[PDB]
Design a protein around this nucleic acid. Structure first.
Lengths: 185, 132, 57, 62
RNA sequence: GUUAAUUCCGAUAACGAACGAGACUCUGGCAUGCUAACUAGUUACGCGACCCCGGUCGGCGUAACUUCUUAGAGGGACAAGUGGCGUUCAGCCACCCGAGAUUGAGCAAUAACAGGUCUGUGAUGCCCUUAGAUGUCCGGGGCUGCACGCGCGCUACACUGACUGGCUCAGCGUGUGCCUACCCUACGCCGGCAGGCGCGGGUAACCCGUUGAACCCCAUUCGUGAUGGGGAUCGGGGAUUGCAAUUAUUCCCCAUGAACGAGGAAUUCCCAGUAAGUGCGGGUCAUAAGCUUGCGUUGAUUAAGUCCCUGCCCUUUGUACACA
């Protein structure tokens, strides 16, 4: 396929980015999509070079945490691939579109900080970072000490975050941070 | 942090002062020129000196440089100093003369003159800036 | 760095001597200092204003 | 109160005690004649859209 | 004003300067250009083996060569070019071209510490002992002792995992000793194992070794149970090193199977091949790495800011401090 790039068996197109605030910071359309999210590096050398990294590679890199799993990128690529398979076999839509909708519906629009704390809004790149971290933390919390595997838990977290039924841990922490920011303002 | 030091800068000023005709604009030409004319024991210091020579030549092409003595710019400075203009603004047919100056010239030897023009005195003695 | 044994105690002597540079290398080193930039003097030449020739043979 | 969108046109300086909030001039993309100054967490480059939940609160300029 | 910098621009009772920084040396990628290679390989052949003209062979040998290997001269990067900010000076940001447009280590100024070392010296001053020795040697014990607390580390608290097979990848390195009695090991037999026995190779790009190292990749067993996680404690046995293992020197087999369910106040290190996971070399070594120093694989999150906390450096101010 020299014309279009097939992410595994998934097309680059049919990705409807609804939020206009994230069209530059979600790099999935027509330039940064690849076959597999595995790569070499160099994306974190400059300040705003991190935004040019694709979001599937960012989930791949943020999944490996907690000592025993730091440095298994092929293994978490396997995790993300089987999780995309479970997302398609439950929803029936594009798992990339489900993940983009999960980022949009899970990224908190405000936060609290210290200048007694005051509520300020966040950068869109910071909101993408917070959404990825909250969904990865929810997936790891759901997969810690459970029969349900890491791919099934990450699939359930992304599908519940795209649905917005307040069942995902990322959605729950987003609502908690929104309530705390509405309180201390 | 890419800032040149005095051992680069003063040596480059001496090189441009003594060998201005041999130096040019291209970095890879005047780098080898500075290598041949000056004994620099290291390529890094040689590149620093050559880069500061190129930057001073850019300053010369943009305009005059204070801390340099170029023979051509000194000749141009001497020509602009020795340039003789047209007839003077001191030689005028109408010279405005204040009345008290006319009185002191009358009290001197040359009272009545040829090409002077006495003017009216500035009525209203308001010449000081207000306070505060 | 040398020692000297006096009657009361032992004193230490540190003598550090910086050697000057020579092109030959007998009284000092052969490689010059890195900070010292050696610049030669240009020869006193006269620019010609009339095209002449030096034909021989 | 509705939810608005605003494009960053100029960043002013680092605010806060630890230096964690940028002082950001935002132009409202709905009405471009009205622009405000806020504090925004995270890295901010000039020329991106932010989602403001309310436009009532506004921090003091230092 | 600017910089990692008393680094420069520029005013200026300053001028000429000096140490430090910078500069310097080494390490690392850029070279299809030079020098070279039977202590390293590549391409073509002469064969030989296997499969149905073609493919593989670290199986052998050779006509060129250094692309892979190594080390020498080098070269290459300097804010070089463009667009902005800035006294248009010192400089800063982005970008085309480009392997790098801030790699790391060493050295590192004046002056001081009543810092550590007399237990490194046949470096040494003063005091003490000096024959029933504080000299020296031999035999044994101890430096490991255990109601307790603290510090650096290792193992885990698991299903992103454990176990079992298959597959597949390195470089720092080290290697037969003045005395010195002690080297690294290929291969074949005995045994499950630690190991034992024989001939070999190597003073080292020759031999270990193409250094067939782990995580990781694939396929079964497990099923949220202190369970096939974990391996503390303890019994029986077998070998290696040493004159001597008892207070198990170390290694291996079976069995017993504790706490630990992500850890409080508080606190350590770090921002790019970095942290972290992971294994391999040297020193300690007769036997030996839960340490340290180097090296390799996988390899991120977050930040390009600040004096808020802890400190440091210039200017001013106040002092009744100057072992400040």
């Amino acid at each position: 396929t020299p014309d279009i790039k097939l992410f595994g068996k998934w097309s680059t197109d049919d990705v409807q980015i609804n939020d206009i605030s994230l069209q530059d910071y979600i790099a999935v359309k027509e330039k940064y999509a690849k076959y597999l999210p595995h790569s070499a590096g160099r994306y974190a050398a400059k300040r705003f070079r991190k935004a040019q990294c694709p979001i599937v590679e960012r989930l791949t890199n943020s999944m490996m945490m907690h000592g025993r799993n730091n440095g298994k990128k092929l293994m978490t690529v396997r995790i993300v691939k089987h999780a995309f398979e479970i997302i398609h076999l439950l929803t029936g839509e594009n798992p990339l579109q489900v993940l983009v909708n999960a980022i949009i519906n899970s990224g908190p629009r405000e936060d609290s900080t210290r200048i007694r704390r005051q509520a300020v809004d966040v950068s869109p790149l910071r909101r993408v970072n917070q959404a990825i971290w909250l969904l990865c933390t929810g997936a790891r919390e759901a997969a810690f000490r459970n029969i349900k595997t890491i791919a099934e838990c990450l699939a359930d977290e992304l599908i519940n975050a795209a649905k917005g039924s307040s069942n995902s841990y990322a959605i729950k922490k987003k609502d908690e941070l929104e309530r705390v920011a509405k309180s201390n303002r | 942090g890419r800032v040149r030091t005095k051992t680069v800068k003063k040596a480059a000023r001496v090189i441009i002062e003594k060998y201005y005709t041999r130096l040019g604009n291209d970095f890879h030409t005047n780098k080898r020129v500075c290598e041949e004319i000056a004994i620099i024991p290291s390529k890094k210091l040689r590149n620093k000196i050559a880069g500061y020579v190129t930057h001073l030549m850019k300053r010369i092409q943009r305009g005059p440089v204070r801390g340099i003595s170029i023979k051509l710019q000194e000749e141009e400075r001497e020509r602009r100093d020795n340039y003789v203009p047209e007839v003077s603004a001191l030689d005028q047919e109408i010279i405005e003369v204040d009345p008290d100056t006319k009185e002191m010239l009358k009290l001197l030897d040359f009272g009545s003159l040829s090409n002077l023009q006495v003017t009216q005195p500035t009525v209203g003695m308001n010449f000081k800036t207000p306070r505060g | 760095v040398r020692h000297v044994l006096l009657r009361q105690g032992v004193l230490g002597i540190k003598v550090k001597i910086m050697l000057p540079w020579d092109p030959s290398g007998k009284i000092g080193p052969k490689k010059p200092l890195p900070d010292h930039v050696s610049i030669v003097e240009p020869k006193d030449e006269i620019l010609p204003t009339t095209p002449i020739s030096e034909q021989k043979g | 109160q509705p939810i608005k969108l605003a494009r960053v046109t100029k960043v002013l300086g680092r605010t806060g005690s630890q230096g964690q909030c940028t002082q950001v001039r935002v132009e409202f993309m709905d009405d471009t004649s009205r622009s405000i100054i806020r504090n925004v967490k995270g890295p901010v480059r000039e020329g991106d859209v932010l989602t403001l939940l309310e436009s009532e609160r506004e921090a003091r300029r230092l």
